[PDB]
Design an enzyme around this catalytic site. Sequence first.
Site, PDB file in Angstrom:
ATOM      1  N   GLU A 138       0.863  -1.269   0.000  1.00  0.00           N
ATOM      2  CA  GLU A 138       0.000   0.000   0.000  1.00  0.00           C
ATOM      3  C   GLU A 138       0.871   1.280   0.000  1.00  0.00           C
ATOM      4  O   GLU A 138       0.538   2.241  -0.684  1.00  0.00           O
ATOM      5  CB  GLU A 138      -0.884   0.062   1.228  1.00  0.00           C
ATOM      6  CG  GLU A 138      -2.057  -1.032   1.199  1.00  0.00           C
ATOM      7  CD  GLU A 138      -3.143  -0.725   0.135  1.00  0.00           C
ATOM      8  OE1 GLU A 138      -3.147   0.384  -0.439  1.00  0.00           O
ATOM      9  OE2 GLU A 138      -3.972  -1.619  -0.137  1.00  0.00           O
TER      10      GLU A 138
ATOM     11  N   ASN B 139      -8.027   9.415  -5.322  1.00  0.00           N
ATOM     12  CA  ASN B 139      -8.886   8.477  -6.122  1.00  0.00           C
ATOM     13  C   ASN B 139      -9.788   9.216  -7.125  1.00  0.00           C
ATOM     14  O   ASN B 139     -10.017  10.388  -6.979  1.00  0.00           O
ATOM     15  CB  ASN B 139      -9.792   7.644  -5.163  1.00  0.00           C
ATOM     16  CG  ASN B 139      -8.983   6.919  -4.073  1.00  0.00           C
ATOM     17  OD1 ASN B 139      -9.203   7.040  -2.849  1.00  0.00           O
ATOM     18  ND2 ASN B 139      -8.038   6.174  -4.529  1.00  0.00           N
TER      19      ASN B 139
ATOM     20  N   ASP C 105     -13.042   9.308  -7.577  1.00  0.00           N
ATOM     21  CA  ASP C 105     -14.197   9.957  -6.938  1.00  0.00           C
ATOM     22  C   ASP C 105     -13.892  11.243  -6.112  1.00  0.00           C
ATOM     23  O   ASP C 105     -14.819  11.804  -5.532  1.00  0.00           O
ATOM     24  CB  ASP C 105     -15.019   8.939  -6.109  1.00  0.00           C
ATOM     25  CG  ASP C 105     -14.271   8.415  -4.818  1.00  0.00           C
ATOM     26  OD1 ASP C 105     -13.167   8.874  -4.468  1.00  0.00           O
ATOM     27  OD2 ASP C 105     -14.784   7.534  -4.131  1.00  0.00           O
TER      28      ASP C 105
ATOM     29  N   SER D 124     -11.975  11.308  -3.347  1.00  0.00           N
ATOM     30  CA  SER D 124     -11.500  10.941  -2.019  1.00  0.00           C
ATOM     31  C   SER D 124      -9.928  10.755  -2.077  1.00  0.00           C
ATOM     32  O   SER D 124      -9.361  10.679  -3.175  1.00  0.00           O
ATOM     33  CB  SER D 124     -12.211   9.675  -1.495  1.00  0.00           C
ATOM     34  OG  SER D 124     -11.858   8.583  -2.366  1.00  0.00           O
TER      35      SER D 124
ATOM     36  N   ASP E 232      -6.472   8.569  -0.153  1.00  0.00           N
ATOM     37  CA  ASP E 232      -5.973   7.516   0.800  1.00  0.00           C
ATOM     38  C   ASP E 232      -4.677   7.990   1.543  1.00  0.00           C
ATOM     39  O   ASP E 232      -3.818   8.658   0.955  1.00  0.00           O
ATOM     40  CB  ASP E 232      -5.543   6.295  -0.004  1.00  0.00           C
ATOM     41  CG  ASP E 232      -6.719   5.599  -0.716  1.00  0.00           C
ATOM     42  OD1 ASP E 232      -7.909   5.767  -0.420  1.00  0.00           O
ATOM     43  OD2 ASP E 232      -6.396   4.847  -1.618  1.00  0.00           O
TER      44      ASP E 232
ATOM     45  N   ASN F 159      -9.029   5.468   3.558  1.00  0.00           N
ATOM     46  CA  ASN F 159      -9.712   6.337   2.586  1.00  0.00           C
ATOM     47  C   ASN F 159     -10.633   7.382   3.249  1.00  0.00           C
ATOM     48  O   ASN F 159     -11.372   7.035   4.176  1.00  0.00           O
ATOM     49  CB  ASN F 159     -10.567   5.405   1.693  1.00  0.00           C
ATOM     50  CG  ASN F 159     -11.253   6.169   0.588  1.00  0.00           C
ATOM     51  OD1 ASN F 159     -12.407   6.454   0.696  1.00  0.00           O
ATOM     52  ND2 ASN F 159     -10.520   6.598  -0.396  1.00  0.00           N
TER      53      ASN F 159
ATOM     54  N   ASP G 231     -15.396  -4.657   9.904  1.00  0.00           N
ATOM     55  CA  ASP G 231     -16.609  -4.084   9.283  1.00  0.00           C
ATOM     56  C   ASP G 231     -17.344  -5.127   8.442  1.00  0.00           C
ATOM     57  O   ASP G 231     -18.337  -4.797   7.823  1.00  0.00           O
ATOM     58  CB  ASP G 231     -16.243  -2.885   8.361  1.00  0.00           C
ATOM     59  CG  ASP G 231     -17.439  -1.902   8.123  1.00  0.00           C
ATOM     60  OD1 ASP G 231     -18.200  -1.593   9.079  1.00  0.00           O
ATOM     61  OD2 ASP G 231     -17.620  -1.455   6.955  1.00  0.00           O
TER      62      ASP G 231
END
Length: 129
Positions: free
Chosen positions: A35, A46, A48, A50, A52, A59, A101
């Site tokens: 990562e 990203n 959209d 957003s 990271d 994110n 989650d």
Amino acid sequence: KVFGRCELAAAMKRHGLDNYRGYSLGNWVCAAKFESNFNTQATNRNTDGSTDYGILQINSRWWCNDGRTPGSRNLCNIPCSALLSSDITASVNCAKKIVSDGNGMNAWVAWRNRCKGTDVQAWIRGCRL
Ligand SMILES: [Cl-]
Ligand SMILES: [Cl-]
Ligand SMILES: [Cl-]
Ligand SMILES: [Cl-]
Ligand SMILES: [Cl-]
Ligand SMILES: [Cl-]
Ligand SMILES: [Cl-]
Ligand SMILES: [Cl-]
Ligand code: NA
């Protein structure tokens, strides 16, 4: 800060990641390598809008607030800049919420594509733990 492989393994163990939700330490060190290349200051934007952040590329759409991702949540209750610190405490605490989650470590695209199903014990070999 850019961590060494065994230095980060030791720091993750101390903060209780080792077998957290059934994932052995080598899984967490492999995800951090692919990562962020073990760099706490890594960021990536990203499509959209957003972004990271940090050694586990968490994110801003769901997990932290960066003041520029309209209509997003902040489930970890933290500004995203907290995830860039040389102290990994904030990143580790937030990762424990993500892995809980429902989708396990599949939340991290690099883990699913480059670590899942591989010999992950290799990432901690030679370390004093
Ligand atoms: Cl390495
Ligand atoms: Cl392991
Ligand atoms: Cl925002
Ligand atoms: Cl901006
Ligand atoms: Cl929220
Ligand atoms: Cl903030
Ligand atoms: Cl630390
Ligand atoms: Cl799982
Ligand atoms: Na957010």
